[PDB]
Short mmCIF file of all heavy atoms in Angstrom, two decimals:
data_model
loop_
_atom_site.label_atom_id
_atom_site.label_comp_id
_atom_site.label_asym_id
_atom_site.label_seq_id
_atom_site.Cartn_x
_atom_site.Cartn_y
_atom_site.Cartn_z
N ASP A 1 68.43 21.75 30.41
CA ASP A 1 68.32 23.05 31.06
C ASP A 1 67.49 22.96 32.34
O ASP A 1 67.88 23.48 33.39
CB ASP A 1 67.69 24.05 30.09
CG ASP A 1 67.86 25.48 30.52
OD1 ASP A 1 68.62 25.73 31.48
OD2 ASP A 1 67.23 26.37 29.90
N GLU A 2 66.35 22.27 32.27
CA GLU A 2 65.38 22.27 33.35
C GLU A 2 65.39 20.97 34.15
O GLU A 2 64.43 20.69 34.87
CB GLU A 2 63.99 22.55 32.79
CG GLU A 2 63.98 23.67 31.77
CD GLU A 2 62.63 23.85 31.11
OE1 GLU A 2 61.65 23.26 31.59
OE2 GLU A 2 62.56 24.58 30.10
N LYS A 3 66.45 20.17 34.02
CA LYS A 3 66.68 19.03 34.89
C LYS A 3 67.97 19.17 35.68
O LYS A 3 67.97 18.97 36.91
CB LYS A 3 66.70 17.73 34.07
CG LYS A 3 67.17 16.50 34.82
CD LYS A 3 66.24 16.18 35.98
CE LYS A 3 66.87 15.18 36.92
NZ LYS A 3 68.13 15.71 37.49
N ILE A 4 69.07 19.50 35.01
CA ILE A 4 70.32 19.78 35.72
C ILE A 4 70.09 20.89 36.73
O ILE A 4 70.25 20.69 37.94
CB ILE A 4 71.44 20.14 34.73
CG1 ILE A 4 71.57 19.04 33.69
CG2 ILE A 4 72.75 20.33 35.46
CD1 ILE A 4 71.91 17.69 34.27
N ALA A 5 69.68 22.06 36.25
CA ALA A 5 69.32 23.14 37.16
C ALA A 5 68.20 22.75 38.11
O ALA A 5 68.06 23.36 39.18
CB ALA A 5 68.93 24.39 36.37
N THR A 6 67.39 21.75 37.76
CA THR A 6 66.35 21.30 38.68
C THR A 6 66.96 20.64 39.90
O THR A 6 66.48 20.84 41.02
CB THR A 6 65.39 20.34 37.97
OG1 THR A 6 64.69 21.03 36.94
CG2 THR A 6 64.39 19.77 38.96
N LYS A 7 68.03 19.87 39.73
CA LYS A 7 68.64 19.19 40.86
C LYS A 7 70.14 19.43 41.00
O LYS A 7 70.75 18.88 41.93
CB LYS A 7 68.37 17.69 40.80
CG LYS A 7 66.91 17.32 41.00
CD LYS A 7 66.74 15.86 41.36
CE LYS A 7 65.27 15.46 41.41
NZ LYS A 7 64.51 16.23 42.43
N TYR A 8 70.75 20.22 40.13
CA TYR A 8 72.19 20.44 40.20
C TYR A 8 72.61 21.87 39.89
O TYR A 8 73.82 22.13 39.83
CB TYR A 8 72.91 19.47 39.26
CG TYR A 8 72.41 18.06 39.42
CD1 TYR A 8 71.36 17.57 38.64
CD2 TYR A 8 72.97 17.21 40.36
CE1 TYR A 8 70.89 16.29 38.80
CE2 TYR A 8 72.51 15.92 40.52
CZ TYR A 8 71.47 15.46 39.73
OH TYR A 8 71.01 14.18 39.89
N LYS A 9 71.67 22.79 39.68
CA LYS A 9 71.91 24.23 39.54
C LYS A 9 73.12 24.53 38.64
O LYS A 9 74.14 25.07 39.07
CB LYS A 9 72.05 24.90 40.92
CG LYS A 9 73.12 24.35 41.85
CD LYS A 9 73.13 25.06 43.18
CE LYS A 9 74.42 24.79 43.92
NZ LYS A 9 74.91 23.40 43.68
N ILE A 10 72.98 24.15 37.37
CA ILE A 10 73.99 24.50 36.38
C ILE A 10 74.19 26.01 36.38
O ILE A 10 73.23 26.78 36.39
CB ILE A 10 73.58 23.99 34.99
CG1 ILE A 10 74.54 24.52 33.92
CG2 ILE A 10 72.14 24.38 34.68
CD1 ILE A 10 75.95 24.04 34.07
N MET A 11 75.45 26.43 36.39
CA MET A 11 75.77 27.85 36.39
C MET A 11 76.02 28.37 34.98
O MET A 11 75.60 29.49 34.66
CB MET A 11 76.98 28.11 37.28
CG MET A 11 76.85 27.49 38.66
SD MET A 11 78.39 27.56 39.60
CE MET A 11 79.49 26.67 38.51
N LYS A 12 76.69 27.59 34.14
CA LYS A 12 76.84 27.87 32.72
C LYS A 12 77.44 26.65 32.06
O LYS A 12 78.15 25.87 32.70
CB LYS A 12 77.72 29.10 32.46
CG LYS A 12 77.45 29.75 31.10
CD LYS A 12 78.15 31.09 30.96
CE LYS A 12 77.96 31.66 29.56
NZ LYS A 12 78.59 30.82 28.51
N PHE A 13 77.15 26.48 30.77
CA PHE A 13 77.50 25.25 30.08
C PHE A 13 77.76 25.56 28.61
O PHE A 13 77.94 26.71 28.22
CB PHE A 13 76.38 24.22 30.26
CG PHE A 13 75.12 24.57 29.54
CD1 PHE A 13 74.84 24.03 28.30
CD2 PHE A 13 74.21 25.44 30.10
CE1 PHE A 13 73.68 24.35 27.63
CE2 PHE A 13 73.04 25.77 29.44
CZ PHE A 13 72.78 25.22 28.20
N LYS A 14 77.79 24.50 27.81
CA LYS A 14 77.96 24.55 26.36
C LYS A 14 77.70 23.15 25.83
O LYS A 14 77.96 22.15 26.51
CB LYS A 14 79.38 25.01 25.99
CG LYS A 14 79.62 25.17 24.50
CD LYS A 14 81.07 25.55 24.22
CE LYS A 14 81.35 26.99 24.61
NZ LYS A 14 82.74 27.38 24.27
N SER A 15 77.17 23.07 24.61
CA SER A 15 76.84 21.77 24.04
C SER A 15 76.66 21.87 22.54
O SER A 15 76.37 22.94 21.99
CB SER A 15 75.57 21.19 24.69
OG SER A 15 75.43 19.83 24.35
N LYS A 16 76.83 20.73 21.88
CA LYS A 16 76.59 20.55 20.45
C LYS A 16 75.99 19.17 20.23
O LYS A 16 76.28 18.24 20.98
CB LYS A 16 77.87 20.68 19.61
CG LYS A 16 78.29 22.09 19.30
CD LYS A 16 79.09 22.70 20.42
CE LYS A 16 79.48 24.12 20.11
NZ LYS A 16 80.10 24.77 21.28
N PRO A 17 75.18 19.00 19.19
CA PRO A 17 74.66 17.67 18.88
C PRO A 17 75.55 16.93 17.89
O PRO A 17 76.07 17.50 16.94
CB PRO A 17 73.29 17.98 18.25
CG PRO A 17 73.52 19.29 17.57
CD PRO A 17 74.57 20.05 18.35
N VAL A 18 75.74 15.63 18.15
CA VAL A 18 76.62 14.80 17.34
C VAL A 18 75.97 13.42 17.16
O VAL A 18 75.25 12.94 18.04
CB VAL A 18 78.03 14.66 17.97
CG1 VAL A 18 78.97 13.88 17.07
CG2 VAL A 18 78.64 16.03 18.28
N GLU A 19 76.25 12.80 16.02
CA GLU A 19 75.78 11.45 15.73
C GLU A 19 76.92 10.47 15.98
O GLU A 19 77.88 10.43 15.21
CB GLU A 19 75.28 11.37 14.29
CG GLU A 19 74.02 12.16 14.07
CD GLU A 19 73.07 12.02 15.24
OE1 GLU A 19 72.31 11.03 15.27
OE2 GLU A 19 73.09 12.89 16.13
N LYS A 20 76.80 9.68 17.04
CA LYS A 20 77.94 8.91 17.51
C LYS A 20 77.60 7.42 17.60
O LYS A 20 76.51 6.97 17.22
CB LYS A 20 78.44 9.45 18.85
CG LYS A 20 79.28 10.70 18.74
CD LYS A 20 80.70 10.38 18.31
CE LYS A 20 81.64 11.52 18.61
NZ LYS A 20 83.01 11.01 18.90
N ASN A 21 78.56 6.66 18.15
CA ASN A 21 78.65 5.22 17.94
C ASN A 21 78.89 4.50 19.27
O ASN A 21 79.45 5.07 20.21
CB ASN A 21 79.80 4.90 16.98
CG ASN A 21 79.72 5.68 15.69
OD1 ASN A 21 78.65 5.86 15.11
ND2 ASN A 21 80.87 6.16 15.23
N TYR A 22 78.49 3.23 19.32
CA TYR A 22 78.65 2.41 20.52
C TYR A 22 78.57 0.94 20.13
O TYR A 22 77.63 0.53 19.45
CB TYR A 22 77.58 2.73 21.57
CG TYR A 22 77.57 1.76 22.73
CD1 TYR A 22 78.32 2.01 23.86
CD2 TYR A 22 76.80 0.61 22.69
CE1 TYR A 22 78.32 1.14 24.91
CE2 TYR A 22 76.79 -0.27 23.75
CZ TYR A 22 77.56 0.01 24.86
OH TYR A 22 77.57 -0.85 25.93
N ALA A 23 79.53 0.14 20.59
CA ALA A 23 79.61 -1.26 20.20
C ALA A 23 79.98 -2.16 21.38
O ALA A 23 80.89 -2.99 21.29
CB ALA A 23 80.61 -1.44 19.05
N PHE A 24 79.29 -2.01 22.50
CA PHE A 24 79.66 -2.75 23.71
C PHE A 24 78.39 -3.22 24.41
O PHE A 24 77.30 -3.22 23.84
CB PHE A 24 80.57 -1.89 24.58
CG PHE A 24 81.70 -1.27 23.82
CD1 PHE A 24 81.60 0.01 23.32
CD2 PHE A 24 82.85 -2.00 23.55
CE1 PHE A 24 82.63 0.56 22.59
CE2 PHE A 24 83.88 -1.45 22.83
CZ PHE A 24 83.77 -0.17 22.34
N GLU A 25 78.55 -3.64 25.67
CA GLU A 25 77.48 -4.33 26.40
C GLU A 25 76.52 -3.31 27.00
O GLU A 25 76.68 -2.85 28.13
CB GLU A 25 78.07 -5.25 27.46
CG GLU A 25 77.04 -5.89 28.39
CD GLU A 25 76.03 -6.75 27.65
OE1 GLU A 25 76.42 -7.46 26.71
OE2 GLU A 25 74.84 -6.71 28.02
N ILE A 26 75.51 -2.94 26.21
CA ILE A 26 74.34 -2.19 26.66
C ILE A 26 73.19 -2.60 25.75
O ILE A 26 73.36 -2.63 24.52
CB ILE A 26 74.58 -0.67 26.65
CG1 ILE A 26 75.18 -0.22 27.98
CG2 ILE A 26 73.29 0.08 26.36
CD1 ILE A 26 75.93 1.07 27.89
N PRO A 27 72.02 -2.93 26.29
CA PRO A 27 71.00 -3.58 25.47
C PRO A 27 70.31 -2.63 24.51
O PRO A 27 69.92 -1.51 24.87
CB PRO A 27 70.01 -4.11 26.51
CG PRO A 27 70.13 -3.14 27.63
CD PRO A 27 71.57 -2.74 27.68
N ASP A 28 70.21 -3.08 23.26
CA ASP A 28 69.27 -2.57 22.26
C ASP A 28 69.63 -1.19 21.72
O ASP A 28 68.99 -0.69 20.79
CB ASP A 28 67.85 -2.55 22.84
CG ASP A 28 67.30 -3.95 23.09
OD1 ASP A 28 68.11 -4.90 23.16
OD2 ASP A 28 66.07 -4.11 23.21
N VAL A 29 70.67 -0.56 22.27
CA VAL A 29 71.10 0.75 21.79
C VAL A 29 72.05 0.53 20.62
O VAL A 29 72.91 -0.36 20.68
CB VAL A 29 71.76 1.56 22.92
CG1 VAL A 29 72.24 2.89 22.41
CG2 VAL A 29 70.77 1.75 24.06
N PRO A 30 71.94 1.29 19.54
CA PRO A 30 72.75 1.04 18.35
C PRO A 30 74.02 1.88 18.30
O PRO A 30 74.19 2.86 19.03
CB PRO A 30 71.79 1.45 17.23
CG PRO A 30 71.11 2.63 17.81
CD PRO A 30 70.91 2.32 19.28
N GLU A 31 74.91 1.49 17.38
CA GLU A 31 76.16 2.18 17.14
C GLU A 31 76.00 3.43 16.29
O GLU A 31 76.99 3.96 15.79
CB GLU A 31 77.18 1.24 16.48
CG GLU A 31 76.83 0.80 15.07
CD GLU A 31 77.45 1.70 14.02
OE1 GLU A 31 78.53 2.28 14.28
OE2 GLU A 31 76.86 1.82 12.93
N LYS A 32 74.77 3.90 16.09
CA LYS A 32 74.54 5.15 15.38
C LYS A 32 73.35 5.82 16.04
O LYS A 32 72.24 5.30 15.98
CB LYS A 32 74.28 4.91 13.90
CG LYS A 32 74.02 6.18 13.10
CD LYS A 32 74.56 6.07 11.68
CE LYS A 32 76.08 6.04 11.66
NZ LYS A 32 76.65 6.21 10.29
N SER A 33 73.59 6.96 16.70
CA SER A 33 72.47 7.62 17.36
C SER A 33 72.72 9.11 17.54
O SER A 33 73.84 9.61 17.38
CB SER A 33 72.18 7.00 18.73
OG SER A 33 71.15 7.73 19.36
N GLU A 34 71.63 9.79 17.85
CA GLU A 34 71.67 11.16 18.36
C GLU A 34 72.37 11.20 19.70
O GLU A 34 72.19 10.31 20.54
CB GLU A 34 70.25 11.70 18.51
CG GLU A 34 70.14 12.94 19.38
CD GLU A 34 68.72 13.36 19.62
OE1 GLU A 34 67.80 12.73 19.05
OE2 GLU A 34 68.50 14.30 20.41
N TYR A 35 73.18 12.24 19.91
CA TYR A 35 73.74 12.51 21.23
C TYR A 35 73.89 14.01 21.38
O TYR A 35 74.29 14.70 20.44
CB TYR A 35 75.09 11.81 21.42
CG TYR A 35 75.02 10.32 21.23
CD1 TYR A 35 75.32 9.74 20.00
CD2 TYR A 35 74.62 9.48 22.26
CE1 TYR A 35 75.24 8.38 19.81
CE2 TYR A 35 74.54 8.12 22.08
CZ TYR A 35 74.85 7.57 20.85
OH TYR A 35 74.77 6.21 20.66
N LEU A 36 73.53 14.50 22.55
CA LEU A 36 73.80 15.89 22.92
C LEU A 36 75.10 15.89 23.71
O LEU A 36 75.14 15.47 24.87
CB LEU A 36 72.66 16.50 23.71
CG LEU A 36 72.88 17.98 24.02
CD1 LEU A 36 72.89 18.79 22.73
CD2 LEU A 36 71.81 18.49 24.96
N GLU A 37 76.19 16.30 23.06
CA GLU A 37 77.49 16.43 23.69
C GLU A 37 77.50 17.70 24.52
O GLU A 37 77.48 18.81 23.98
CB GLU A 37 78.57 16.46 22.63
CG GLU A 37 79.98 16.52 23.17
CD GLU A 37 81.02 16.55 22.07
OE1 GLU A 37 80.62 16.58 20.89
OE2 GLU A 37 82.23 16.54 22.38
N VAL A 38 77.52 17.54 25.84
CA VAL A 38 77.48 18.65 26.79
C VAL A 38 78.83 18.72 27.50
O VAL A 38 79.25 17.74 28.13
CB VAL A 38 76.35 18.48 27.81
CG1 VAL A 38 76.37 19.63 28.80
CG2 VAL A 38 75.01 18.37 27.12
N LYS A 39 79.50 19.86 27.40
CA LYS A 39 80.73 20.07 28.14
C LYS A 39 80.44 20.91 29.38
O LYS A 39 79.50 21.69 29.41
CB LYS A 39 81.77 20.79 27.27
CG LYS A 39 82.08 20.09 25.96
CD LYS A 39 83.16 20.83 25.21
CE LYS A 39 83.46 20.17 23.88
NZ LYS A 39 84.51 20.91 23.13
N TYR A 40 81.28 20.72 30.40
CA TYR A 40 81.29 21.66 31.52
C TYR A 40 82.49 21.35 32.39
O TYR A 40 82.90 20.20 32.52
CB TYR A 40 80.00 21.60 32.34
CG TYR A 40 79.86 20.34 33.15
CD1 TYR A 40 80.02 20.34 34.52
CD2 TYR A 40 79.55 19.14 32.53
CE1 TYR A 40 79.88 19.19 35.26
CE2 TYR A 40 79.40 17.98 33.26
CZ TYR A 40 79.57 18.01 34.63
OH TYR A 40 79.43 16.85 35.36
#
């Protein structure tokens, strides 16, 4: 809320939290994590 609008002035949005997965080349991040799924 206070970073996007801080530099990108979000006008309106929507989001849900999901526990998701990743199995590729990025260090130390696991295939099970918190994620804030934000649509716009």
Side-chain angles (χ1 to χ4, degrees):
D1 195 10
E2 316 174 12
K3 170 63 194 60
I4 306 300
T6 295
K7 292 198 187 299
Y8 312 91
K9 56 182 196 325
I10 173 64
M11 310 170 302
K12 203 170 176 296
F13 69 97
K14 184 183 287 183
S15 193
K16 278 84 181 172
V18 184
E19 291 320 276
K20 282 281 198 149
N21 307 319
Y22 171 91
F24 311 95
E25 173 60 40
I26 272 157
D28 293 19
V29 178
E31 67 93 29
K32 180 146 291 192
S33 177
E34 164 186 356
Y35 303 95
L36 184 65
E37 183 180 3
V38 178
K39 305 183 181 179
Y40 70 107

